[PDB]
Amino acid sequence: TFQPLNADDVRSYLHKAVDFISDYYKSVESMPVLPNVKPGYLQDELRASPPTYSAPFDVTMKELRSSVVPGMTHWASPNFFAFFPSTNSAAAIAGDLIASAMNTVGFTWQASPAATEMEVLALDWLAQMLNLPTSFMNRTGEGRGTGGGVILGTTSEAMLVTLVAARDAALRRSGSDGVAGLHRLAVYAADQTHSTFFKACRLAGFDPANIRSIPTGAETDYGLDPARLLEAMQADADAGLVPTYVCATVGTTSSNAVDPVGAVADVAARFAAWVHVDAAYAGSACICPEFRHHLDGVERVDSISMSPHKWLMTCLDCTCLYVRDTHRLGEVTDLKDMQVGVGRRFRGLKLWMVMRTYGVAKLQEHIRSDVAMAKVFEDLVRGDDRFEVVVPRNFALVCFRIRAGAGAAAATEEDADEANRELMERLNKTGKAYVAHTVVGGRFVLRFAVGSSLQEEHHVRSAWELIKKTTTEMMN
Amino acid sequence: TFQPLNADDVRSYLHKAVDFISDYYKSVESMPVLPNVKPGYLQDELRASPPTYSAPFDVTMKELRSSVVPGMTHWASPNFFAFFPSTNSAAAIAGDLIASAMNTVGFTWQASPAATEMEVLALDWLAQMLNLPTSFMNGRGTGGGVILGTTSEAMLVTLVAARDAALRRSGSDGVAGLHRLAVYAADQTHSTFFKACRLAGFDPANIRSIPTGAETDYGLDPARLLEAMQADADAGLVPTYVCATVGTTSSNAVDPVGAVADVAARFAAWVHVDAAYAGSACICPEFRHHLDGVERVDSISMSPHKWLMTCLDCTCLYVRDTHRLTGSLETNPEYLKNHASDSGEVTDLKDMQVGVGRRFRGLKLWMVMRTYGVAKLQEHIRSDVAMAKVFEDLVRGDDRFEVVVPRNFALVCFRIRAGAGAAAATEEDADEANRELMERLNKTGKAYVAHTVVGGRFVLRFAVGSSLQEEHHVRSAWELIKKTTTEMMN
Numbered sequence: 001t002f003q004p005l006n007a008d009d010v011r012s013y014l015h016k017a018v019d020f021i022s023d024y025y026k027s028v029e030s031m032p033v034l035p036n037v038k039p040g041y042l043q044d045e046l047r048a049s050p051p052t053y054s055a056p057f058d059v060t061m062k063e064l065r066s067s068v069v070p071g072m073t074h075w076a077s078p079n080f081f082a083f084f085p086s087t088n089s090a091a092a093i094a095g096d097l098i099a100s101a102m103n104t105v106g107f108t109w110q111a112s113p114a115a116t117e118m119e120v121l122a123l124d125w126l127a128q129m130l131n132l133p134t135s136f137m138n139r140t141g142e143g144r145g146t147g148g149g150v151i152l153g154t155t156s157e158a159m160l161v162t163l164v165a166a167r168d169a170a171l172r173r174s175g176s177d178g179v180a181g182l183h184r185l186a187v188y189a190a191d192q193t194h195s196t197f198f199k200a201c202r203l204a205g206f207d208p209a210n211i212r213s214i215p216t217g218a219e220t221d222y223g224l225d226p227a228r229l230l231e232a233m234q235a236d237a238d239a240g241l242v243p244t245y246v247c248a249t250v251g252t253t254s255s256n257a258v259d260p261v262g263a264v265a266d267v268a269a270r271f272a273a274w275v276h277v278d279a280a281y282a283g284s285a286c287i288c289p290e291f292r293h294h295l296d297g298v299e300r301v302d303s304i305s306m307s308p309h310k311w312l313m314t315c316l317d318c319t320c321l322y323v324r325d326t327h328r329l330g331e332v333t334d335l336k337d338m339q340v341g342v343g344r345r346f347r348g349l350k351l352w353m354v355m356r357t358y359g360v361a362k363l364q365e366h367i368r369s370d371v372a373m374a375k376v377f378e379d380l381v382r383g384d385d386r387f388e389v390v391v392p393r394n395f396a397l398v399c400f401r402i403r404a405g406a407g408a409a410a411a412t413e414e415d416a417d418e419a420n421r422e423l424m425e426r427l428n429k430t431g432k433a434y435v436a437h438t439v440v441g442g443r444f445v446l447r448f449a450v451g452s453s454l455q456e457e458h459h460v461r462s463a464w465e466l467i468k469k470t471t472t473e474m475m476n
Numbered sequence: 477t478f479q480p481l482n483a484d485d486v487r488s489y490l491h492k493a494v495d496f497i498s499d500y501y502k503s504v505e506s507m508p509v510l511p512n513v514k515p516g517y518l519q520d521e522l523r524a525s526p527p528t529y530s531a532p533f534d535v536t537m538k539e540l541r542s543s544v545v546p547g548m549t550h551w552a553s554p555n556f557f558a559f560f561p562s563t564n565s566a567a568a569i570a571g572d573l574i575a576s577a578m579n580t581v582g583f584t585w586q587a588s589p590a591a592t593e594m595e596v597l598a599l600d601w602l603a604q605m606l607n608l609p610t611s612f613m614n615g616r617g618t619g620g621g622v623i624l625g626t627t628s629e630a631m632l633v634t635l636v637a638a639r640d641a642a643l644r645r646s647g648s649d650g651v652a653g654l655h656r657l658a659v660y661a662a663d664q665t666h667s668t669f670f671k672a673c674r675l676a677g678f679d680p681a682n683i684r685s686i687p688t689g690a691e692t693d694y695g696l697d698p699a700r701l702l703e704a705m706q707a708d709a710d711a712g713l714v715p716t717y718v719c720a721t722v723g724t725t726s727s728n729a730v731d732p733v734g735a736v737a738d739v740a741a742r743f744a745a746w747v748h749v750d751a752a753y754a755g756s757a758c759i760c761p762e763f764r765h766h767l768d769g770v771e772r773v774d775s776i777s778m779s780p781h782k783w784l785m786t787c788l789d790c791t792c793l794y795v796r797d798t799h800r801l802t803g804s805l806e807t808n809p810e811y812l813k814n815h816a817s818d819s820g821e822v823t824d825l826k827d828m829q830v831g832v833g834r835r836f837r838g839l840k841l842w843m844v845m846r847t848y849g850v851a852k853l854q855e856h857i858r859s860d861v862a863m864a865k866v867f868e869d870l871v872r873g874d875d876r877f878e879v880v881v882p883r884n885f886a887l888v889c890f891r892i893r894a895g896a897g898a899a900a901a902t903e904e905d906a907d908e909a910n911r912e913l914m915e916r917l918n919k920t921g922k923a924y925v926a927h928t929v930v931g932g933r934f935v936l937r938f939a940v941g942s943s944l945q946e947e948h949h950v951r952s953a954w955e956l957i958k959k960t961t962t963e964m965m966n
């Protein structure tokens with residue numbers, strides 16, 4: 001007689017969750033962003049073993065409020081300025097809640113036609129917003145495109161499955177007896193490409209000796225130099241190796257550098273190498289015409305991925321992978337075989353609800369107002385000669401630091417490094433900011449990632465005042 | 477001025493979503509389990525392009541109700557009898573909703589301490605319910621766990637760790653020796669395991685699918701696995717990894733975990749146990765013998781999103797040595813560095829998976845266990861098994877049918893017997909009578925049944941346990957099977 005989905009529990013448990021969410025957003029700014037807990041704190045709060053008997057849902061919610069929430073890093077805080085913000089929206093949450101309750105597994109079209117078609121629809125809609133060519137689309141207005149997409153869990157998964165497909169294609173182009181020729185395949189990316197990409201290369205079985213990290217410098221604002229890429233790919237070809245795959249990044253994690261997509265595709269075309277564009281974060285911006293030039297040349301790459309669960313108001317997980325001309329690998333399906341796992345949840349519903357409820361114009365203004373807030377912060381930094389902006393700001397991420405010579409406590413470039421680390425730790429201890437760092441050209445650098453969903457312009461200005469106040473009392 | 481998380485919208489959108497969920501559960505039994513739509517219907521109804529302007533959320537919900545629901549296969553229906561049911565609960569739905577709204581990204585402990593510490597706690601609690609050997613749990617232990625999205629990812633990361641250890645110790649020159657590694661699983665192993673082998677770079681010629689037969693109830697014969705591994709070693713290949721399944725997808729065969737581990741230990745091969753479905757039953761003492769020998773395997777995975785009332789995605793991976801996983805999966809990018817990670821006192825769970833980012837999936841799993849407790853979880857397993865037993869004994873009492881294999885859990889395999897009537901004189905005729913019984917059951921909309929092949933024969937699966945499903949739904953399904961069968965005969 002125990003019914004886990006009985007009508008009363010479903011309504012009252014979900015109403016309590018909704019109440020908690022409302023209160024959480026209303027009060028999250030009043031909490032320290034970074035929690036003041038040490039490793040292991042939780043097992044000293046909660047029971048060591050699962051309970052034998054049931055408890056009222058109120059007990060569970062009270063432990064969430066008393067023991068979970070205080071040990072969280074509040075990504076949702078308007079004062080979260082770290083990594084890339086996980087932007088979100090009421091429609092996305094609603095869509096993921098409905099997907100959880102229907103709880104379908106879409107491993108074939110027949111296993112739920114609406115879920116498969118909605119994911120294809122969501123992908124084709126976003127592709128239009130990005131102005132991707134018809135070669136990346138499943139359905140068009142009146143017919144079929146020549147491409148396809150799939151909604152993956154992470155950008156890493158997108159890299160893996162396109163690495164695997166390029167790997168198997170190059171193994172057969174080079175007359176390999178199964179994987180016997182795998183030790184001749186080489187792969188390439190700038191040194192600013194995410195480290196998870198080189199990990200994906202090793203997971204796919206590429207040889208560590210043949211995984212190339214191409215050095216970048218400040219003379220290209222740390223974007224990949226196509227001449228350096230050609231030099232490396234030509235040297236491998238002349239040495240008997242097979243250039244198999246190049247990853248170009250639009251909007252690197254560290255400093256938001258941009259690889260020149262068209263020029264990278266031209267260089268790789270000399271060797272028939274697969275080209276994948278990783279635009280996990282900055283891809284979202286490319287739904288706006290003034291950012292779409294960053295994807296010029298996408299029509300000549302093999303695949304492209306971006307993550308709505310960063311900068312397009314869709315909660316995790318939601319990474320969109322697009323593949324050109326899928327014939328090289330009436331029915332309506334996504335690229336189901338280009339995932340790690342056959343059967344996972346219905347991720348397309350929330351992406352569609354975001355697009356259907358808010359529309360293109362509001363998504364575009366969401367991007368533009370984040371960029372404008374980032375420009376406000378950048379111009380404030382540029383107005384204080386104790387600081388420097390270390391690279392041009394391309395999107396909504398600013399990299400800045402206390403420069404050497406800003407005070408006696410920042411006399412050398414190594415003293416500036418420790419001053420910037422000290423500033424970051426002091427900001428985080430206030431609870432009114434979460435700032436994290438990177439290293440750019442050998443220098444310790446603070447990142448400032450604008451765009452947390454509750455964040456407004458006055459939050460960014462207030463963070464800048466706090467940075468100024470903290471720096472000033474550091475220089476005594 | 478556009479604020480997607482404003483308080484008014486957050487409250488009313490979610491209240492409309494809850495009202496929809498309430499209606500859905502109350503009405504889903506009355507819908508046909510399988511939809512009646514053609515491929516491509518959706519973009520016809522919604523449009524080919526996204527809208528430029530905004531719309532009230534009520535319109536989004538109306539398009540959900542009018543265009544999406546009529547095209548769904550209703551996994552939540554009490555009359556869904558295919559694959560394995562995706563059991564769910566109010567607590568798991570509530571946990572996932574809360575996790576979606578907080579929307580933290582727990583790649584490191586520091587990125588959100590509670591997200592990682594509750595996942596560890598939830599894994600430890602489940603390990604206790606399963607009575608896993610303490611070597612799988614975590615101050616000198618090396619065992620530990622990770623929640624992943626899928627069994628496929630769990631197979632992938634353990635295959636990669638096994639591969640890297642085999643290449644290292646067998647003197648491979650980089651990956652030049654990768655074509656010498658071999659892996660083994662019974663032919664009843666889920667096809668995603670063979671796909672994960674191909675993803676990791678194993679040679680298709682070296683991926684061994686061991687035949688099984690009725691002699692072992694289609695479980696892996698350990699003598700035949702030893703034969704296959706010894707032959708490969710004698711030929712200069714390196715036996716690298718063995719996958720044992722407890723509760724196979726097709727007929728719920730169970731591999732002998734202890735004996736398989738003992739065979740593979742002659743070659744120092746990695747042993748992984750896939751208990752995706754049936755692992756949840758092992759929280760009950762009368763089923764826990766199916767995991768005997770697990771103390772000698774390297775890894776085991778199981779999915780609460782099948783039979784433990786936790787909505788997708790939720791798959792738990794346990795290993796006896798996390799260092800063998802993090803050795804292959806860890807990264808150390810500068811922008812992620814923090815003092816807690818440097819101290820060695822935490823495991824950043826990005827180092828236990830393919831990706832960097834990850835949802836707070838521990839919350840829903842902890843909420844299920846915390847709210848319902850072990851005894852209710854146990855009774856949930858037992859009462860599904862008793863419903864399957866009811867259906868199995870009903871099949872056994874009708875001479876026109878056979879139960880094709882012994883029933884270990886809550887899946888019954890059964891068949892219109894050969895020689896049951898005129899439309900099933902020969903076995904080739906039975907194969908077509910069963911395909912027509914299946915397709916007719918599905919056309920009524922009061923059932924969804926899908927088939928399998930057991931020993932060359934067309935077999936219907938009857939997978940009991942959809943969360944809304946009660947015993948009278950199973951008895952009524954049997955009555956519908958008899959009725960359709962009699963009409964077929966004349």
Ligand SMILES: *Cc1c(COP(=O)(O)O)cnc(C)c1O
Binds near residue numbers: 157832
């Ligand atoms: C966020 C980020 C990633 C992280 O990838 P996941 O596997 O989805 O966590 C990869 N690439 C870039 C450019 C990123 O900004």
Ligand SMILES: *Cc1c(COP(=O)(O)O)cnc(C)c1O
Binds near residue numbers: 341627628666
């Ligand atoms: C259902 C099933 C699977 C499916 O794995 P996923 O990748 O999570 O879809 C794997 N193994 C077994 C035994 C199963 O029954």
Ligand SMILES: *NCCc1c[nH]c2ccc(O)cc12
Binds near residue numbers: 084085253310834
């Ligand atoms: N390199 C970490 C930044 C990151 C990684 N994975 C993510 C998912 C979502 C998000 O907002 C940031 C992020």
Ligand SMILES: [Ca+2]
Binds near residue numbers: 142520
């Ligand atoms: Ca048409």
Ligand SMILES: [Ca+2]
Binds near residue numbers: 366453455
């Ligand atoms: Ca904003």
Ligand SMILES: [Ca+2]
Binds near residue numbers: 817820
């Ligand atoms: Ca470490």
Ligand SMILES: [Ca+2]
Binds near residue numbers: 856859941942945
């Ligand atoms: Ca039940």
